Amino acid sequence: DPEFDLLLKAWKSSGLSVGMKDDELLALLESCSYRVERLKAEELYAIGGDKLQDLRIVGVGEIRAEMVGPSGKQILIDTLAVGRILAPALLFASENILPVTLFANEDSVLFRIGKEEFKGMMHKYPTLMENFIGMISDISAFLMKKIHQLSL
């Protein structure tokens, strides 16, 4: 399959596409410029805080992702399959950005979209805007419930 069809399959399986017709989703992705990151199975990768300001979607495979605090502990372990977005709540962050660690359970591929380009894509489609905002908002709610779990 062409790379573009992998990207479409990942988006249709993503929460970003909910409520969007196939026509406007196709148009959005046909005009999009993206880069490809390939993760070899059973390897560990690190992404610093300064390089988390792009939209990353799992195009192929499955990855165990974790945040790394300032002291060294890895929190928020999560396994992302095709269609999930890597650390979306940190895309538009300007402070307190924790580095991320990724382990490939298979041969995996992430598609990377620039910050400014994704901002334009969100402006053009209000549905994509609300869906991404709801994604990061639900992440915030989950983090708050976890904080209550950890609090004494």
Binding characters for its own copies, 69-98, by CB under 8 A (x = yes): --xxxx--x---------------------
CB closer to its own copies out of 32 and 76: 76
Q: Which of 81, 99, 77, 78 shows the shortest CA–CA distance to 90?
A: 99
Which pairs from 146-149 meet CB under 8 Å and 24+ separation?
146/76
116 contacts its own copies (rule: CB under 8 A): no
49 contacts its own copies (rule: CB under 8 A): yes
Q: Is 15 exposed, middle or buried (0-12, 13-18, 19+ CB in 10 A)?
A: middle
In whole angstroms, give the CA distance from residue 19 to residue 27.
Answer: 15
From 7-15, 29-37, 48-56, 134-142, give the range in contact with its own copies by CB under 8 A. 48-56
AA letter at 27: A
From 16-24, 42-50, 113-121, 122-130, give the range in contact with its own copies by CB under 8 A. 42-50
From 8-16, 53-61, 64-72, 124-132, give the range in contact with its own copies by CB under 8 A. 64-72
Helix (H, G, I), strand (E, B) or coil at 3: helix
121 contacts its own copies (rule: CB under 8 A): no
Pairing between β-strand 63-68 and β-strand 100-104 as defined by DSSP bridges: antiparallel
CB of 12 to its own copies, least distance (A): 29
Q: Which residues bind its own copies (CB under 8 A)?
A: 42-50, 64, 66, 68, 71-74, 77, 99, 101, 103
